[PDB]
RNA sequence: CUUAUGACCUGGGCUACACACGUGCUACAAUGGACAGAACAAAGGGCAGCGAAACCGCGAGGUUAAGCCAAUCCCACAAAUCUGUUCUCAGUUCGGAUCGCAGUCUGCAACUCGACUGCGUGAAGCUGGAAUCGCUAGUAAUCGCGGAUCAGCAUGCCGCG
């Protein structure tokens, strides 16, 4: 996207405000690979979905400008 | 002529109270400078050899000497004699006045020069110039460069330990 | 050279500067409408002062080794970060999305 | 010092293009020079682009 | 001749392409339904307990606790304490 | 076959890639490249559809918006061509992939997995072995354009000069 801000889905937004306002906590199993990542993601790891387990993945001061996207090894190959 | 009165009534008496030694005889100089070609072109061509005979006398007109190696070497399929690379030895007076054309006009021609290597010091205070490409100074005149092989260049101090001449090159301008 | 690496003596003013690694065709014309030398002269035939001008519109950009660096900078961050997009350009194949049983010869 | 191998030593006045004016004693006998040391920004402490240039992002916001 | 028999059953991995029938064996730490693998370092077994790793990416190593890869880990975050099951 | 071989949802995949094959375009240049000037089509499409002019963005476009249910208005200023200027035979002012950064649109959403600009980067290749394929006159080749298909996407296929 361009101007509409970075994409968010709206139980995505919802959890990680719950997770940031006391303390980090479990992993998520997000379904939402589609969404991007914010700055206050930092150090929260979630679980994203491959096409047939959740991967756990972190977030780190680095990985801030990408999507969820970039972490899903969907496709193994040897 | 510029740099031995800079060397002489700045740069001696500076790191002579830097370091508290007794006597002007135990202020280290920087005497001699000596510049290998080492080129293993005699093996594929000999008139490569030639390359580089003439042109390191238009660097400093002292002329190289031919460096014949004193082991055969079939790894390198290399016999004995057989010469390889050119020597340039340099001590006196325009020897610091090739290094007023080392730092001041040479270095910016390094088209990605930074600060170059600190901790390459052999333990004694002596110095190797980490050089791959001889274009350095307004002589090389492109079109009359062929061979594309770069230039070593050894700095030799008569300094005692060897952080002190890490303190010398500094008072001369090496930058780091 | 002002980039550290020379342009060709009788080549125009234009494309003699495009050999320099980071200026493209219109980076070049950016520099000359700044410039203003009509873009067609010998570049062995200037002026000091008409090419001190040349120099320091190429120092305001990023031009030899910072432009090297910030793209390799890149590949380094993008791999070491995970990033699929840096698995791509680590194994040898191709990034910006395209197939894998058709050609790609330009990584093997 | 051998005669007819040594080439000479001429007093070259080594000018910068940004003006700074040198002294060694070389073969040839004029240089003229784009970028000196003193012309090099490296040498002027910190240079002024890339010592501003070289941050990494500030994980942007900004639009 | 029993040991050229070990040397012919080189392709037993070959059954691990293409899936292997496996649980969610694994617990990761209640939570169930993680990629997960078991670590080529120490095998993972009940002896020891068994830590989760999570790795930059492509997978989660469960490195058998009390392993000297699992001991000298930088950012100890990355370790989960999840469960043989 | 049937509390599953049926139905629903998310997300993945149909786009994988050590490698061969057909089938298509863009090229390896001087009958070319670059810039400028001048002039010339046919057919089709348009109602939540086309969008002029206008302004702003380097631009892809954005903005508002006349007019058009259409031989009225819009898509759409055709390209090759012609005439100048410059280029001078080399992996280059040909090549344009590959790739980085910066962007725009549509859409819930462009990561796998879209198109198109803007900047950069600039490889492979300098008419391709044996062998093969098309074509009897507006055809051979060549250059653009329209449409189905579609929110979006064509080097595809139809159709047009």
Redesign the interface.
Same mark, same amino acid.
Do not use: A, M
């Given at each position: 996207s361009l101007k509409k801000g970075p994409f968010v889905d709206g139980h995505l937004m919802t959890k990680i405000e719950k997770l940031n306002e006391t303390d980090k906590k479990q992993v998520v199993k997000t379904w939402s690979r589609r969404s991007t990542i914010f700055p206050q993601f930092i150090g929260h790891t979630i679980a994203v979905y491959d096409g047939r387990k959740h991967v756990p993945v972190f977030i780190s001061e680095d990985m801030v400008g990408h999507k969820l996207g970039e972490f899903a090894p969907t496709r193994t190959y040897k | 002529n510029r740099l031995k009165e800079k060397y002489n009534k700045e740069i001696a008496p500076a790191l002579m109270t830097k370091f508290n030694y007794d006597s002007v005889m135990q202020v280290p100089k920087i005497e001699k400078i000596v510049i290998n070609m080492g080129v293993g072109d005699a093996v594929q061509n000999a008139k490569a050899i030639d390359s580089a005979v003439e042109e390191l006398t238009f660097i400093a007109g002292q002329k190289p000497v031919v460096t014949r190696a004193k082991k055969s070497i079939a790894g390198f399929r290399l016999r004995e004699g057989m010469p390889i690379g050119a020597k340039v030895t340099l001590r006196g007076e325009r020897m610091y006045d090739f290094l007023d054309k080392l730092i001041s006009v040479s270095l910016p021609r390094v088209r990605d020069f930074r600060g170059v290597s600190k901790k390459s010091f052999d333990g004694r205070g002596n110095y190797t110039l980490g050089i791959k490409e001889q274009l350095i100074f307004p002589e090389i005149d492109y079109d009359k460069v062929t061979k594309v092989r770069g230039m070593d260049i050894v700095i030799v101090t008569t300094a005692n330990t060897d952080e002190e001449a890490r303190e010398l090159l500094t008072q001369v301008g090496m930058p780091f | 050279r002002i980039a550290g690496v020379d342009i060709p003596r009788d080549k125009r003013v234009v494309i003699s500067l495009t050999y320099i690694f980071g200026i493209g065709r219109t980076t070049a014309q950016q520099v000359l409408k700044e410039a203003g030398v009509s873009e067609d002269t010998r570049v062995r035939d200037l002026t000091e002062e008409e090419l001190g001008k040349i120099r320091d519109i190429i120092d305001k950009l990023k031009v030899e080794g910072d432009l090297r660096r910030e793209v390799s900078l890149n590949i380094k961050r993008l791999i070491e970060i995970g990033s699929y997009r840096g698995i791509r350009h680590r194994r040898g194949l191709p990034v910006r999305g395209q197939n894998s049983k058709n050609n790609a010869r330009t990584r093997k | 010092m051998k005669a007819g191998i040594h080439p000479n030593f001429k007093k070259a006045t080594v000018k910068c293009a940004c003006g700074n004016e040198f002294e060694t004693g070389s073969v040839k006998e004029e240089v003229r020079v784009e970028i000196c040391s003193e012309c090099h920004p490296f040498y002027t402490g910190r240079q002024k682009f890339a010592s501003a240039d070289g941050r990494v992002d500030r994980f942007n916001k900004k639009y | 001749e029993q040991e050229k028999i070990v040397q012919e059953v080189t392709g037993e991995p070959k059954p691990y392409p293409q899936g292997r029938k496996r649980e969610a064996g694994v617990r990761? +730490?209640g *939570?169930d339904? #993680? #990629?997960v693998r078991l670590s080529k370092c120490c095998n993972p077994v009940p002896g020891d307990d068994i830590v989760g790793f *999570?790795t +930059? &990416?492509? &997978?989660?190593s469960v490195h058998r606790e009390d392993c000297p890869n699992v001991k000298t880990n930088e950012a100890q975050?990355?370790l *989960?304490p999840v469960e043989w099951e």
């Open positions: - | - | - | - | 990761v +730490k *939570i339904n #993680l #990629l *999570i +930059k &990416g492509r &997978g989660v975050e990355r *989960i």
